[PDB]
Design an enzyme around this catalytic site. Structure first.
Site, PDB file in Angstrom:
ATOM      1  N   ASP A  47      35.815  43.246  24.140  1.00  0.00           N
ATOM      2  CA  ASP A  47      35.791  42.193  23.040  1.00  0.00           C
ATOM      3  C   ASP A  47      34.312  41.828  22.968  1.00  0.00           C
ATOM      4  O   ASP A  47      34.405  41.272  21.675  1.00  0.00           O
ATOM      5  CB  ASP A  47      36.967  41.293  23.447  1.00  0.00           C
ATOM      6  CG  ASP A  47      37.072  40.664  24.716  1.00  0.00           C
ATOM      7  OD1 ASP A  47      36.262  40.793  25.408  1.00  0.00           O
ATOM      8  OD2 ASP A  47      38.171  39.864  25.164  1.00  0.00           O
ATOM      9  N   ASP A  69      34.976  32.494  33.925  1.00  0.00           N
ATOM     10  CA  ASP A  69      36.347  33.117  34.216  1.00  0.00           C
ATOM     11  C   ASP A  69      36.471  33.684  35.820  1.00  0.00           C
ATOM     12  O   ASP A  69      37.482  33.533  36.209  1.00  0.00           O
ATOM     13  CB  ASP A  69      36.438  34.296  33.459  1.00  0.00           C
ATOM     14  CG  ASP A  69      36.721  33.945  31.871  1.00  0.00           C
ATOM     15  OD1 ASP A  69      37.108  32.916  31.771  1.00  0.00           O
ATOM     16  OD2 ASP A  69      36.439  35.074  31.078  1.00  0.00           O
TER      17      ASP A  69
END
Ligand SMILES: OC[C@H]1O[C@@H](O[C@H]2[C@@H](OC[C@H]3O[C@@H](O[C@H]4[C@H](O)[C@@H](O)[C@H](O[C@H]5[C@H](O)[C@@H](O)[C@H](O)O[C@@H]5CO)O[C@@H]4CO[C@H]4OC[C@@H](O)[C@H](O)[C@H]4O[C@@H]4O[C@H](CO)[C@H](O)[C@H](O)[C@H]4O)[C@H](O)[C@@H](O)[C@@H]3O[C@@H]3O[C@H](CO[C@H]4OC[C@@H](O)[C@H](O)[C@H]4O)[C@@H](O)[C@H](O)[C@H]3O)OC[C@@H](O)[C@@H]2O)[C@H](O)[C@@H](O)[C@H]1O
Ligand SMILES: OC[C@H]1O[C@@H](O[C@H]2[C@@H](OC[C@H]3O[C@@H](O[C@H]4[C@H](O)[C@@H](O)[C@H](O)O[C@@H]4CO)[C@H](O)[C@@H](O)[C@@H]3O[C@@H]3O[C@H](CO[C@H]4OC[C@@H](O)[C@H](O)[C@H]4O)[C@@H](O[C@@H]4O[C@H](CO)[C@@H](O)[C@H](O)[C@H]4O)[C@H](O)[C@H]3O)OC[C@@H](O)[C@@H]2O)[C@H](O)[C@@H](O)[C@H]1O
Ligand SMILES: [Br-]
Ligand SMILES: [K+]
Ligand SMILES: [K+]
Length: 731
Positions: free
Chosen positions: A36, A449
């Site tokens: 992405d 993350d």
């Protein structure tokens, strides 16, 4: 000029969402992955690693690292295509593009589209939007977002035009009323799937199926080679089709549906089978949406091409306790599941998982309370694919990794499958900060993350991200220049934000207390002797000083919230801050700051750094192309700054070990010098520069975090946003 460098990733293995894995239908071991925010990759079976294909995407076309779809040609495995672009809102200023290649992604040509492609938008796990006619391979379709509908190329992707007979461009968006303008975009036409039996070699395939993100009209068909299109008779309603997989052996189209576009949500759905000869629809859901036991939609649909009565599908999404995968060996008449409840909270499993090659995938807790296990099977598991050349191989993407098995058919004999990560070389993290201290480990990463790591060896995956505290994302990290084993890091965790401190270089951390109003990590600076911390947290209305190594805080009255804070590297009494065109200086160890520079420096600038060993030497970088731009330096502790005339634009700056016989550290910038955009080194205090990257190694929107290496001449730690952490060495 330029200088030959070697660029490599600091080894982490994965760390982000892989929305699509793609097997070439004709050639064994030809596999691609799309991401992405970090381009696309091709698997290399000889080195058991992935090869990034889009590192040539640069500063100006940065959104082309968004890969919405990828197609690999079954009729010519040399040919591959990608649909690229990152955002369909204002965040990506450019339109998307179809990239084409005839050498498996080693080189590309681009054809820009007149609309945006949403590589990092909602719905990006649906696909594949790009599909090549398997009989006549000059024909390629692309399902577009934004109401653009269905698009087509009849010349191997060189030119593209709207298929104007395909009139439904879709009406679903995740949240039409999102005031942030991120969830409100039309996800559009979501996949295209051919019937290979509807043509023969060199002739147009007559039967094509198309999925649209419209709950009332999810499936279209053309039976005339794409001239005209119909909503398919008798189809179900109320759901969005994540996947449509056609089997010409049995003449059936399998579709997996969910009530949202993904990739984060999905509460209900169904799996249907459409039999083409009869036009019959059959609900083959392992658990149908009419059941109140169902708490997820369906995606990760795949068929075993070598045994096409076998198919699999997965939860989109089951968070708790874990994802669920289902397997049928009889065309969906019945299913078994990869785990089952025995007596709550206990489960039996049809798999085992070995993460010894990527041990941080336990997220720092190998024993959470049942029913949870660690590592988890997965989440955001949209892409689940069985190898069409080997019924025993399956690969799936999660929000952190790719997992793979090579004994999938053990499932069918009543055994357990073995799953392992398969992400060597697939480096997808976003680097938020990075430090290289002068003793101990070569580099510490602060990552989105997955927290970040002390990297003891740049070729070895670290054992664990930071713990106690374990941030979801580390936003800033610093070390005390004169006592580098003293470190601090800030970041995000569950609710809001927090601070971790250490005096043994991270052998042990502990969590500090928070000042008021913290919602995220913000940024942090540590005095050179370790004796004060200045923290600008996210959310808070002030910046704060701790004199007690994190236990208590006091508001600093002159600083705007969110100011960028840095410590002098020599004098513990000196801290500095930058905010919106004002530079501020503390000479009393962070207790108070005063504005020293209020003009002459770009309001956009938000990166600056003090030089190790040079008290009061500060370099500052930033601006914009519609204001002013450049690199500035202060040699008097921020009282004033001079613009370096040798640089046109700069966005970050750092320092590293001096050239042999030079009197000043090497300086590294992200910037533009003599009309070239890139990465630049100066070994003469910024009098001139040498480019140390090149046009194949640009890494798009990179450089948010960089660091030189005070121990290694030439070395730059180069952060990227979606390609992990790189290190460059002069060759
Ligand atoms: O070994 C695994 C290990 O993981 C540790 O966590 C890691 C990890 O997290 C993965 C993923 O976690 C999401 O949070 C889950 C949560 O863990 C679930 O328990 C919860 O279950 C609910 C669900 O919310 C309900 O809708 C459903 O009915 O019931 C279940 C079970 O009770 O789901 C959340 C996700 O929930 C949300 O998303 C879907 C929506 O339907 C839902 O409404 C929404 O929940 C709301 O979310 C907001 C704030 O966002 C708030 O908490 C509300 O109170 C809540 O209701 C994280 O949300 C997700 O971000 C993590 O995945 C990573 O996401 C990255 C992108 O981040 C951003 O964008 C999404 C947004 O949610 C974030 O806030 C934002 O930052 C992405 O790039 C990356 O690829 C994804 O993997 O992995 C990453 C790491 O950072 C975490 O620390 C966990 O601590 C440990 O215990 C163990 O499980
Ligand atoms: O209302 C928004 C909403 O966002 C929600 O998060 C969703 C969202 O995050 C965007 C960020 O995605 C990161 O990628 C992750 C990826 O989506 C995951 O699938 C993957 O596993 O992990 C990835 C890493 O975490 C990505 O790293 C971020 O960069 C991205 O943030 C946005 O970046 C854009 C682009 O800017 C950047 O690139 C260009 C550079 O020039 C710029 O310096 C970079 O920072 C930002 O847009 C810019 O905005 C500024 C000012 O507003 C403008 O000046 C500028 O012109 C424009 O280019 C954007 O602001 C920033 O958000 O989308 C992906 C989805 O997965 C997430 O769930 C949050 O959860 C919500 O709370 C809310 O914020
Ligand atoms: Br759930
Ligand atoms: K497809
Ligand atoms: K759910």
């Amino acid at each position: 000029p330029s200088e030959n460098y070697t660029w490599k990733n600091v080894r982490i293995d994965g760390g982000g969402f892989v929305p699509g894995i793609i097997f070439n239908q004709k050639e064994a071991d030809l596999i691609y992955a799309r991401t992405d925010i970090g381009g696309a990759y091709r698997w290399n079976s000889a080195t058991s690693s992935w090869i990034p294909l889009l590192d040539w995407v640069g500063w100006d076309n940065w959104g082309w690292n968004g890969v919405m779809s990828l197609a690999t040609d079954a009729a010519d495995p040399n040919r591959v295509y990608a649909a690229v672009g990152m955002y369909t809102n204002t965040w990506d200023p450019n339109n998307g593009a179809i990239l084409r290649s005839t050498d498996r992604g080693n080189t590309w040509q681009a054809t820009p589209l007149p609309f945006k492609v949403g590589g990092n938008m909602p719905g990006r796990g649906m696909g594949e939007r790009l599909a090549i006619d398997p009989n006549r391979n000059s024909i390629i379709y692309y399902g577009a977002e934004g109401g653009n509908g269905l698009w087509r190329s009849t010349d191997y992707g060189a030119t593209w035009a709207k298929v104007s007979s395909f009139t439904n461009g879709g009406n679903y968006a995740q949240d039409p009323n999102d005031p942030n303008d991120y969830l409100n975009k039309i996800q559009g036409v979501v996949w295209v799937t051919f019937d290979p039996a509807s043509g023969s070699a060199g002739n147009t395939s007559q039967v094509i199926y198309v999925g649209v993100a419209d709950t009332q009209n999810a499936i279209y068909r053309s039976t005339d080679g794409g001239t005209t299109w119909s909503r398919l008779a008798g189809q179900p309603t109320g759901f969005l089709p994540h996947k449509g997989v056609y089997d010409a052996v049995n003449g059936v189209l399998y579709i997996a549906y969910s009530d949202t576009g993904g990739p984060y949500d999905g509460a209900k759905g169904d799996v249907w089978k459409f039999t083409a000869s009869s036009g019959t629809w059959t609900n083959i859901s392992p658990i149908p949406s009419s059941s109140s036991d169902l708490y997820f939609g369906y995606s990760g649909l795949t068929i075993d091409r070598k045994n096409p009565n076998t198919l699999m599908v997965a939860s989109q999404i089951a968070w708790w306790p874990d994802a669920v995968f289902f397997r049928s060996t009889n065309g969906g008449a019945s299913w078994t599941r990869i785990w089952d409840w025995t007596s709550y909270p206990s489960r039996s499993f049809r798999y085992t998982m070995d993460i010894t090659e990527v041990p941080w995938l336990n997220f720092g807790n190998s024993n959470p309370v049942a029913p949870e296990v660690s590592p988890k099977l997965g989440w955001m598991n949209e892409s689940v694919e069985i190898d069409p050349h080997n019924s025993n191989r399956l690969m799936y993407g999660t929000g952190a990794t790719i997992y793979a098995t090579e004994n999938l058919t053990s499932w069918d004999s009543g055994g357990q499958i073995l799953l392992k990560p398969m992400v060597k070389g697939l480096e997808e993290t976003a680097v938020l900060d990075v430090v290289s201290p002068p003793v101990g480990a070569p580099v510490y990463s602060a990552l989105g993350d997955i927290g970040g790591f002390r990297h003891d060896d740049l070729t070895k995956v670290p054992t664990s991200m930071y713990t106690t505290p374990n941030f979801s994302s580390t936003t800033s990290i610093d070390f005390a220049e004169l006592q580098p084993a003293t470190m601090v890091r800030v970041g995000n965790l569950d609710s809001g934000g927090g601070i971790g401190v250490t005096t043994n270089a991270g052998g042990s951390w502990w969590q500090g207390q928070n000042p008021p109003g913290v919602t995220s990590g913000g940024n942090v600076a540590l005095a050179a002797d370790g004796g004060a911390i200045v923290w600008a947290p996210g959310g808070s209305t002030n910046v704060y000083l701790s004199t007690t190594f994190g236990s208590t805080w006091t508001a600093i009255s002159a600083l705007p919230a969110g100011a960028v804070i840095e410590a002098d590297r020599v004098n513990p009494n000196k801290f500095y801050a930058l905010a919106n065109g004002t530079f501020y200086v503390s000479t009393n160890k962070g207790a108070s700051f005063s504005a020293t520079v209020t003009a002459g420096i770009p309001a956009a600038a938000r990166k600056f750094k003090a030089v190790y060993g040079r008290e009061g030497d500060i370099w500052l970088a930033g601006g914009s192309s519609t204001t002013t731009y450049g690199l500035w330096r202060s040699t008097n502790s921020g009282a004033s700054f001079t613009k370096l005339a040798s640089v046109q634009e700069a966005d970050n700056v750092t320092f590293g070990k001096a050239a042999t016989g030079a009197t000043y550290p090497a300086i590294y910038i992200i910037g533009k010098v003599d009309n070239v955009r890139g990465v630049f080194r100066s070994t003469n205090e910024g009098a001139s520069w040498v480019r140390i990257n090149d046009d194949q190694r640009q890494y798009g929107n990179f450089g948010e975090a960089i660091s030189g290496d005070p121990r290694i001449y030439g070395r730059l730690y180069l952060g990227t946003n979606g390609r992990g952490l790189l290190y460059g060495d002069s060759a």
